[PDB]
Amino acid sequence: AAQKSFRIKQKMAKAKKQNRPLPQWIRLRTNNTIRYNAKRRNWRRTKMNI
Amino acid sequence: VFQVSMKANKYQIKKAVKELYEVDVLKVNTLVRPNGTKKAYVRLTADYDALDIANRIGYI
Amino acid sequence: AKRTKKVGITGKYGVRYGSSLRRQVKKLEIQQHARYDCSFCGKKTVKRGAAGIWTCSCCKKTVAGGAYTVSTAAAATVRSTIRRLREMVEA
Amino acid sequence: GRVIRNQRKGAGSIFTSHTRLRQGAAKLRTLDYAERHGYIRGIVKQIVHDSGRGAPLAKVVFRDPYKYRLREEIFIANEGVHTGQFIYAGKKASLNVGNVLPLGSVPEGTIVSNVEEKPGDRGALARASGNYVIIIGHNPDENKTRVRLPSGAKKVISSDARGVIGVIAGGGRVDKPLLKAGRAFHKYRLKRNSWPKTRGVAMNPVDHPHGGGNHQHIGKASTISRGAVSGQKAGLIAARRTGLLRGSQKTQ
Amino acid sequence: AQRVTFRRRNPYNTRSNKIKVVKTPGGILRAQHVKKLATRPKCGDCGSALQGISTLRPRQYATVSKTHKTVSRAYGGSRCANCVKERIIRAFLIEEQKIVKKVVKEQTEAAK
Amino acid sequence: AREITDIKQFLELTRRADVKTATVKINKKLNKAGKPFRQTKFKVRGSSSLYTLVINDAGKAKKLIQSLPPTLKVNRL
Amino acid sequence: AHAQSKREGRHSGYGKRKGTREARLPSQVVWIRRLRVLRRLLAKYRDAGKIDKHLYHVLYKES
RNA sequence: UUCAAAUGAGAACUUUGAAGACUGAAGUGGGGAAAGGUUCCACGUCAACAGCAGUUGGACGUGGGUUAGUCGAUCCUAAGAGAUGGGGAAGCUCCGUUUCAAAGGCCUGAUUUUAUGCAGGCCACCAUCGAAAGGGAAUCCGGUUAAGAUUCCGGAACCUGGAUAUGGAUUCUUCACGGUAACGUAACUGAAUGUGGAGACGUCGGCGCGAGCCCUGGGAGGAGUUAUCUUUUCUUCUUAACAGCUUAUCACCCCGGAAUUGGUUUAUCCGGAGAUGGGGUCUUAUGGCUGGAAGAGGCCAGCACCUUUGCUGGCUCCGGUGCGCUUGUGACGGCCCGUGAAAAUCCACAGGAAGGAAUAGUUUUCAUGCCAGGUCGUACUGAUAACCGCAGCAGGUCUCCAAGGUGAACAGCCUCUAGUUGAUAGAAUAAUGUAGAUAAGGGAAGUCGGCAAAAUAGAUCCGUAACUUCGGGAUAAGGAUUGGCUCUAAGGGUCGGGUACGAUCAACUUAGAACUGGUACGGACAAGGGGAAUCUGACUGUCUAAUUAAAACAUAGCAUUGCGAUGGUCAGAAAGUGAUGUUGACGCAAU
RNA sequence: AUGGUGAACUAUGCCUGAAUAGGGUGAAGCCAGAGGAAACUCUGGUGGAGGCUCGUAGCGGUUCUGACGUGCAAAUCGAUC
Ligand SMILES: [Mg+2]
Ligand SMILES: [Mg+2]
Ligand SMILES: [Mg+2]
Ligand SMILES: [Mg+2]
Ligand SMILES: [Mg+2]
Ligand SMILES: [Mg+2]
Ligand SMILES: [Mg+2]
Ligand SMILES: [Mg+2]
Ligand SMILES: [Mg+2]
Ligand SMILES: [Mg+2]
Ligand SMILES: [Mg+2]
Ligand SMILES: [Mg+2]
Ligand SMILES: [Mg+2]
Ligand SMILES: [Mg+2]
Ligand SMILES: [Mg+2]
Ligand SMILES: [Mg+2]
Ligand SMILES: [Mg+2]
Ligand SMILES: [Mg+2]
Ligand SMILES: [Mg+2]
Ligand SMILES: [Mg+2]
Ligand SMILES: [Mg+2]
Ligand SMILES: [Mg+2]
Ligand SMILES: [Mg+2]
Ligand SMILES: [Mg+2]
Ligand SMILES: [Mg+2]
Ligand SMILES: [Mg+2]
Ligand SMILES: [Mg+2]
Ligand SMILES: [Mg+2]
Ligand SMILES: [Mg+2]
Ligand SMILES: [Mg+2]
Ligand SMILES: [Mg+2]
Ligand SMILES: [Mg+2]
Ligand SMILES: [Mg+2]
Ligand SMILES: [Mg+2]
Ligand SMILES: [Mg+2]
Ligand SMILES: [Mg+2]
Ligand SMILES: [Mg+2]
Ligand SMILES: [Mg+2]
Ligand SMILES: [Mg+2]
Ligand SMILES: [Mg+2]
Ligand SMILES: [Mg+2]
Ligand SMILES: [Mg+2]
Ligand SMILES: [Mg+2]
Ligand SMILES: [Mg+2]
Ligand SMILES: [Mg+2]
Ligand SMILES: [Mg+2]
Ligand SMILES: [Mg+2]
Ligand SMILES: [Mg+2]
Ligand SMILES: [Mg+2]
Ligand SMILES: [Mg+2]
Ligand SMILES: [Mg+2]
Ligand SMILES: [Mg+2]
Ligand SMILES: [Mg+2]
Ligand SMILES: [Mg+2]
Ligand SMILES: [Mg+2]
Ligand SMILES: [Mg+2]
Ligand SMILES: [Mg+2]
Ligand SMILES: [Mg+2]
Ligand SMILES: [Mg+2]
Ligand SMILES: [Mg+2]
Ligand SMILES: [Mg+2]
Ligand SMILES: [Mg+2]
Ligand SMILES: [Mg+2]
Ligand SMILES: [Mg+2]
Ligand SMILES: [Mg+2]
Ligand SMILES: [Mg+2]
Ligand SMILES: [Mg+2]
Ligand SMILES: [Mg+2]
Ligand SMILES: [Mg+2]
Ligand SMILES: [Mg+2]
Ligand SMILES: [Mg+2]
Ligand SMILES: [Mg+2]
Ligand SMILES: [Mg+2]
Ligand SMILES: [Mg+2]
Ligand SMILES: [Mg+2]
Ligand SMILES: [Mg+2]
Ligand SMILES: [Mg+2]
Ligand SMILES: [Mg+2]
Ligand SMILES: [Mg+2]
Ligand SMILES: [Mg+2]
Ligand SMILES: [Mg+2]
Ligand SMILES: [Mg+2]
Ligand SMILES: [Mg+2]
Ligand SMILES: [Mg+2]
Ligand SMILES: [Mg+2]
Ligand SMILES: [Mg+2]
Ligand SMILES: [Mg+2]
Ligand SMILES: [Mg+2]
Ligand SMILES: [Mg+2]
Ligand SMILES: [Mg+2]
Ligand SMILES: [Mg+2]
Ligand SMILES: [Mg+2]
Ligand SMILES: [Mg+2]
Ligand SMILES: [Mg+2]
Ligand SMILES: [Mg+2]
Ligand SMILES: [Mg+2]
Ligand SMILES: [Mg+2]
Ligand SMILES: [Mg+2]
Ligand SMILES: [Mg+2]
Ligand SMILES: [Mg+2]
Ligand SMILES: [Mg+2]
Ligand SMILES: [Mg+2]
Ligand SMILES: [Mg+2]
Ligand SMILES: [Zn+2]
Numbered sequence A: 001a002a003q004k005s006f007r008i009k010q011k012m013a014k015a016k017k018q019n020r021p022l023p024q025w026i027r028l029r030t031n032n033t034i035r036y037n038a039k040r041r042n043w044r045r046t047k048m049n050i
Numbered sequence B: 001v002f003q004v005s006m007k008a009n010k011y012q013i014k015k016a017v018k019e020l021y022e023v024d025v026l027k028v029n030t031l032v033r034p035n036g037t038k039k040a041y042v043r044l045t046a047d048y049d050a051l052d053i054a055n056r057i058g059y060i
Numbered sequence C: 001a002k003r004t005k006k007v008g009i010t011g012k013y014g015v016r017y018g019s020s021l022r023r024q025v026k027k028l029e030i031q032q033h034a035r036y037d038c039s040f041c042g043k044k045t046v047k048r049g050a051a052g053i054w055t056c057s058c059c060k061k062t063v064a065g066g067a068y069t070v071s072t073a074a075a076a077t078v079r080s081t082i083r084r085l086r087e088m089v090e091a
Numbered sequence D: 001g002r003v004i005r006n007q008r009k010g011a012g013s014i015f016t017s018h019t020r021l022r023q024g025a026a027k028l029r030t031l032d033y034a035e036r037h038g039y040i041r042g043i044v045k046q047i048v049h050d051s052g053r054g055a056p057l058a059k060v061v062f063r064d065p066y067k068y069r070l071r072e073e074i075f076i077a078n079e080g081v082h083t084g085q086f087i088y089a090g091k092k093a094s095l096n097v098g099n100v101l102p103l104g105s106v107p108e109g110t111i112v113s114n115v116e117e118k119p120g121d122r123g124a125l126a127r128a129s130g131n132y133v134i135i136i137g138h139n140p141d142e143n144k145t146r147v148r149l150p151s152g153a154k155k156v157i158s159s160d161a162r163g164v165i166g167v168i169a170g171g172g173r174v175d176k177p178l179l180k181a182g183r184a185f186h187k188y189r190l191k192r193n194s195w196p197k198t199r200g201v202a203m204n205p206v207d208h209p210h211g212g213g214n215h216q217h218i219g220k221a222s223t224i225s226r227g228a229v230s231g232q233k234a235g236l237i238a239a240r241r242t243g244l245l246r247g248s249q250k251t252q
Numbered sequence E: 001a002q003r004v005t006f007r008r009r010n011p012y013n014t015r016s017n018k019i020k021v022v023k024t025p026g027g028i029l030r031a032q033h034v035k036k037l038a039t040r041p042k043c044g045d046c047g048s049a050l051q052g053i054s055t056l057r058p059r060q061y062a063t064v065s066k067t068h069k070t071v072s073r074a075y076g077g078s079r080c081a082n083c084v085k086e087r088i089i090r091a092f093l094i095e096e097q098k099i100v101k102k103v104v105k106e107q108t109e110a111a112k
Numbered sequence F: 001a002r003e004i005t006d007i008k009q010f011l012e013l014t015r016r017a018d019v020k021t022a023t024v025k026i027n028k029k030l031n032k033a034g035k036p037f038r039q040t041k042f043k044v045r046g047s048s049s050l051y052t053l054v055i056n057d058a059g060k061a062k063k064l065i066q067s068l069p070p071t072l073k074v075n076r077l
Numbered sequence G: 001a002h003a004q005s006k007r008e009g010r011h012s013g014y015g016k017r018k019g020t021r022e023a024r025l026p027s028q029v030v031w032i033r034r035l036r037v038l039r040r041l042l043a044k045y046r047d048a049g050k051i052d053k054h055l056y057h058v059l060y061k062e063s
Numbered sequence H: 001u002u003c004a005a006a007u008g009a010g011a012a013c014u015u016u017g018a019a020g021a022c023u024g025a026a027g028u029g030g031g032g033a034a035a036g037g038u039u040c041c042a043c044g045u046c047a048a049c050a051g052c053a054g055u056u057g058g059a060c061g062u063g064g065g066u067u068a069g070u071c072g073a074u075c076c077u078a079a080g081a082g083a084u085g086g087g088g089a090a091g092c093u094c095c096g097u098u099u100c101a102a103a104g105g106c107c108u109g110a111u112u113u114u115a116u117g118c119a120g121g122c123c124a125c126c127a128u129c130g131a132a133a134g135g136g137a138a139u140c141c142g143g144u145u146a147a148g149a150u151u152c153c154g155g156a157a158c159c160u161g162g163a164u165a166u167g168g169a170u171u172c173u174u175c176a177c178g179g180u181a182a183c184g185u186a187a188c189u190g191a192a193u194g195u196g197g198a199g200a201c202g203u204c205g206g207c208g209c210g211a212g213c214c215c216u217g218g219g220a221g222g223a224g225u226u227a228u229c230u231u232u233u234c235u236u237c238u239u240a241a242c243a244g245c246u247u248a249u250c251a252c253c254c255c256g257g258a259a260u261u262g263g264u265u266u267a268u269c270c271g272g273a274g275a276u277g278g279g280g281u282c283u284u285a286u287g288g289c290u291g292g293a294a295g296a297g298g299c300c301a302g303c304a305c306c307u308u309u310g311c312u313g314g315c316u317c318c319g320g321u322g323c324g325c326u327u328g329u330g331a332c333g334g335c336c337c338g339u340g341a342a343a344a345u346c347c348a349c350a351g352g353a354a355g356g357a358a359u360a361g362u363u364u365u366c367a368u369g370c371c372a373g374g375u376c377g378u379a380c381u382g383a384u385a386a387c388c389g390c391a392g393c394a395g396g397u398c399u400c401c402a403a404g405g406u407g408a409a410c411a412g413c414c415u416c417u418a419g420u421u422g423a424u425a426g427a428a429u430a431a432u433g434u435a436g437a438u439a440a441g442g443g444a445a446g447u448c449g450g451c452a453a454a455a456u457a458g459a460u461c462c463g464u465a466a467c468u469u470c471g472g473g474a475u476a477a478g479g480a481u482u483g484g485c486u487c488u489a490a491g492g493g494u495c496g497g498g499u500a501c502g503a504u505c506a507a508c509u510u511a512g513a514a515c516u517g518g519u520a521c522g523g524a525c526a527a528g529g530g531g532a533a534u535c536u537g538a539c540u541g542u543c544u545a546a547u548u549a550a551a552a553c554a555u556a557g558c559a560u561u562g563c564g565a566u567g568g569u570c571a572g573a574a575a576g577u578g579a580u581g582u583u584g585a586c587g588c589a590a591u
Numbered sequence I: 001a002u003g004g005u006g007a008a009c010u011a012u013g014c015c016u017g018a019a020u021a022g023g024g025u026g027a028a029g030c031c032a033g034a035g036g037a038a039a040c041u042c043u044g045g046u047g048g049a050g051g052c053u054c055g056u057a058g059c060g061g062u063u064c065u066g067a068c069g070u071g072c073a074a075a076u077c078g079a080u081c
Helices: A006-018 B010-021 B050-057 C008-013 C019-032 C073-087 D005-011 D033-037 D181-189 E058-063 E082-110 F007-014 F058-067 G002-007 G027-047 G053-062
Strands: B002-004 B025-033 B037-044 C046-048 C053-056 C062-064 D040-048 D057-063 D070-076 D086-089 D100-102 D111-113 D133-139 D144-148 D156-158 D162-165 E018-023 E029-034 F002-004 F021-030 F036-045 F050-055 F073-076
Touching: B002 B010, B010 B025, B010 B037, C008 C019, C062 D040, C073 D111, D040 D070, D086 D100, F002 F007, F007 F036, F007 F050, F007 F058, F036 F058, F050 F058, G027 G053
Parallel strands: F002 F050, F021 F073
Antiparallel strands: B002 B037, B025 B037, C046 C053, C053 C062, D040 D057, D040 D086, D057 D070, D100 D162, D111 D133, D111 D162, D133 D144, D144 D156, E018 E029, F021 F036, F036 F050
């Protein structure tokens, strides 16, 4: 919040990383069933509660 | 510019640079990248040319 | 020019609180803001602040007194009745 | 029903004393060797206002008879004491305003403040601005000293009990009208959250014995017995009489 | 007509956040935070701002030479030189009267 | 961050062990209400302070330039 | 241009006055000026010896 | 809101240029705190989302970006929180925080087996957590990015810790001299212990000063206007931390000995406890000159050319004014039954333990020199779209900076700088609406009721009732006047006079007089309706957030009650428990 | 009934901070002046008191029983206060 604890900054870093589309090669795997990334987050829609 | 262990402080960078690259370090500035990684801005004394020492390690 | 016929310092409260209350205050308020003679240095520089406390402008002496006047009639006689009793224990 | 106001005070959340600015605790010196065999000298280094208190305090510094150091006490300023005065404290000590003497060692008629209930409690009786106790006699065997307290009560205490000659500064403070709410506000602001007082007769019955009714009234006798129980005691507790006290007061 | 901004996160007008406006060589206005003003030291006896002594904030008195923190007479950076005049006369007179107090009550013991 | 005028003290600074580099600055200014003159500023960079000696006399300047120690790096202008 | 006309005692009638005469120029400012001007004359008139201190001291308290 | 171009399959909606407007420094500006967490920036890009559109986006896809000895945290203590010997409790756990406890650690000497056992002496201080607004070691200016900067680059400092050596100082009178004194300084040993000070403190008022802003003269440049007028209109002309010298209201010293009392503030306070006067000392807020530093930055000209993009120059100067504005600060004064934190930390003094030179010592509070300074935060938004209100919601949400005119003004109204021009659009203008207005004659007849609306209003002057707690009532009521232009008069500063005046510089205030107009003139804006009574609450104040603001609650005042601590009232399951209580009847508690 | 979770709203105390255009009124204190045989009474200034006052921001929420009443909004908007 413009002056952070490292605990909060770390979690912020992990959330950034998790925020990417489904790596499209996984779709090609044998017996693959994952169509898309069903856990995509967005700051303007769902707040991540610290 | 090096990606550096989060556990490493400004001293351990300066030392680990000299040992691994045979260079004199003037000063070391660090920051935590916004993905939980450490970035060292390592500046060499005027004797060493960074550009040369950069394609001596290989990247370019 | 005479500014007010009776309220004096008490005119700041204006019409409020009732004549009699204002009258009682005016008395003690006049009592408490006044300059008093200093026992120690013989000037009239004793003034109050913090009811009970009376200090002298120069000579920097501070005397414990009455809430709105330096000497209170009670402590006055107590002074004398102690003066009397003390003298019973030397003569 | 609800828990009534006077019951909530004992928990002491919002009712504890507003203490930040206080000067300290006013106390006679510890009743050490010097004070109970001879006397000890000090200088009132300052007389000062104690927040929330009527009477000014007197900072009086002494020498430490056992270590090389100054040790300062906090006395209540007896009227007439001043900066720079020498205060003497001891069995054998002159009967002068400001000094502290064992009740046994002053004649009758002496007028003292901050007097000890039992000897050594460093000051119990006659502390509020303007009060004092008068010694009204002695019993040398058992060395009691009969005194009269500001209430009028006549307690008898040990002759070793210590008091300070004189009366307490700041008298007459209660002769001036507060004149308006704010004065009382800033008054209790530095004492404790006792002000202002909603009448129990203006609340609903959950709140108080006096609450409710289509008119505002007590409804039963407001004299509550000593044996009453918490939440009952409100009004005139254990009143032995009631009504406008006409005729001369002044205990016989 | 040119306005200015704080230079530190603290956005309120606290006594530790005093500001001065300054014109720089760039030809523009820019704030510069001001440390709280220092006060003068005081005579422990009387209480006046005892002269001769430089006036800094307390941690700064460790970055200044001893001559700035004293005056040459006894009780230098401590008492106001009229109190010293007084605690001299008082000392001397009391020691003198103390001698007077002894031989007077010595003769008392020889005739009483 | 310090000004100097003792031309003797100056040469003593220029030969102080920590002093390795110096610099001479040439300014054109005016003389008291009228014509111009040539002010020189001898700046000696010490290990914690930059001493600078202002020699308004053009003649005193040239004589003082050769006076400089030969082993001293002296940035000109 | 308007400031010049103002300097020439213009646009200052009762119909151009919105703040009270006291708000426009305080009585005290007028007094402090005058009484400081009078206080200044008594000093120089004395320090030059034009008026002895016994007349000065009286004029001061009458000022 | 509009024109046009560019772009694109596609353009009311994107980009650019042009025009019209707005926010009007109490911002639609420039930043932060909490909260968000990548929205920041670039590139690509329109299926869903942006209640029309979309080539645009806080969307989508892909990347890049947050650099510190000095800014914060970190340290300190505040209310408070909470371990510990213990005491309760079946027990989860409750109580106590220096508390009925054998509570702990520093200086250096002893060692020359040798490393740290013991020989002294202290300290009895007794956890810890708790402030990104309190306290607090120390940094500035210029330059730089697509996006970072008091953090990078450049240059110039400063603090702290660790080392240290050379120079100066000091000593044969061992631990500096000088001044009558205030006190002076480049230095000028100082253990235990003790003591003092700084940290460290309300509020309002006028008065004095500082800074930045505002206004303005001459000049040296650039820009606009020029049918005509304007030696004109606009704009550039800057100087950081740090360093040296200097600079002060107050305070203080020396000479002196005062009624004919004197000095003196806007504000009456000072003097035989020594004034007025004359001469000195001090704090360095703050300002000045210089170093930093013109080499920077600002403004221009004159040539170079696909480029990296240069190069040569010149100028950057001297002043004026103040009930101005914002802020800072000083010496005072008003107020209190209110008298307006704490600790860390730093210094000084008192003390004299000790150690210390003549054939050579003591000195690191003087100068200079050496090394080092970690860990985490650092992007952006901060709101009619980055927070909370299911949302890009007309709501809510702490704060700094703050130009010109009109005017009493941070009002309203217009402007400069900066930022916007965001809110589906087109055509009509029926009824009925919502919001803004006007109406002949009457004038509350309307209505539960003047609800709504209207009338009033600034300022100067005149005038002003009952009644009253003498303070008020009172802007009572009721009147007159108010533009423009051209004049008159009054109100100041500064410098020489042997031990009456002259000379010159700079300010809008107030009054009076002429002239003048379709009788208008607080010309927009701004801005009280008044009076006579009854009921009721004394008053200012408080409440039913979201149908009740009142006569209800409160209050001062009045009166009653309890209590002397082995106590009153009150809390708890209990207790070596707790509130009042840092208390003591001028008190606390209860009506 | 039992065992639990809340003072991000709000109520109240405490700690530590911060904030509030411009006007009207003219209380004590003070200086000079006038009258009177006396007691004493007057006048003009100065000063700048107040849970004083007109009135913004602020805090409130009186009336239109105005807008809205499948809202901008589960309490808002305008005017007035
Ligand atoms: Mg949600
Ligand atoms: Mg959750
Ligand atoms: Mg960092
Ligand atoms: Mg119950
Ligand atoms: Mg307590
Ligand atoms: Mg209360
Ligand atoms: Mg009540
Ligand atoms: Mg009551
Ligand atoms: Mg009720
Ligand atoms: Mg009941
Ligand atoms: Mg009952
Ligand atoms: Mg009832
Ligand atoms: Mg009743
Ligand atoms: Mg910032
Ligand atoms: Mg000194
Ligand atoms: Mg000095
Ligand atoms: Mg006045
Ligand atoms: Mg003058
Ligand atoms: Mg006089
Ligand atoms: Mg449009
Ligand atoms: Mg456009
Ligand atoms: Mg506009
Ligand atoms: Mg405005
Ligand atoms: Mg920002
Ligand atoms: Mg793009
Ligand atoms: Mg599409
Ligand atoms: Mg969206
Ligand atoms: Mg759409
Ligand atoms: Mg679409
Ligand atoms: Mg993206
Ligand atoms: Mg990305
Ligand atoms: Mg810091
Ligand atoms: Mg740390
Ligand atoms: Mg516990
Ligand atoms: Mg802590
Ligand atoms: Mg802090
Ligand atoms: Mg702080
Ligand atoms: Mg910059
Ligand atoms: Mg960069
Ligand atoms: Mg930025
Ligand atoms: Mg740098
Ligand atoms: Mg350098
Ligand atoms: Mg050092
Ligand atoms: Mg010397
Ligand atoms: Mg200390
Ligand atoms: Mg202190
Ligand atoms: Mg403080
Ligand atoms: Mg600085
Ligand atoms: Mg003098
Ligand atoms: Mg002298
Ligand atoms: Mg001097
Ligand atoms: Mg003035
Ligand atoms: Mg302010
Ligand atoms: Mg005070
Ligand atoms: Mg000090
Ligand atoms: Mg040193
Ligand atoms: Mg360490
Ligand atoms: Mg930033
Ligand atoms: Mg936005
Ligand atoms: Mg949200
Ligand atoms: Mg919104
Ligand atoms: Mg301008
Ligand atoms: Mg913006
Ligand atoms: Mg819309
Ligand atoms: Mg529209
Ligand atoms: Mg339409
Ligand atoms: Mg219509
Ligand atoms: Mg019409
Ligand atoms: Mg009509
Ligand atoms: Mg009519
Ligand atoms: Mg009628
Ligand atoms: Mg009718
Ligand atoms: Mg009716
Ligand atoms: Mg009517
Ligand atoms: Mg109406
Ligand atoms: Mg009309
Ligand atoms: Mg009337
Ligand atoms: Mg006219
Ligand atoms: Mg004139
Ligand atoms: Mg003239
Ligand atoms: Mg009416
Ligand atoms: Mg009422
Ligand atoms: Mg309601
Ligand atoms: Mg309800
Ligand atoms: Mg109301
Ligand atoms: Mg209501
Ligand atoms: Mg009554
Ligand atoms: Mg027990
Ligand atoms: Mg809360
Ligand atoms: Mg404040
Ligand atoms: Mg007005
Ligand atoms: Mg006002
Ligand atoms: Mg006469
Ligand atoms: Mg006033
Ligand atoms: Mg008011
Ligand atoms: Mg009002
Ligand atoms: Mg107004
Ligand atoms: Mg309110
Ligand atoms: Mg409002
Ligand atoms: Mg409303
Ligand atoms: Mg309605
Ligand atoms: Mg409808
Ligand atoms: Mg209003
Ligand atoms: Zn005195």
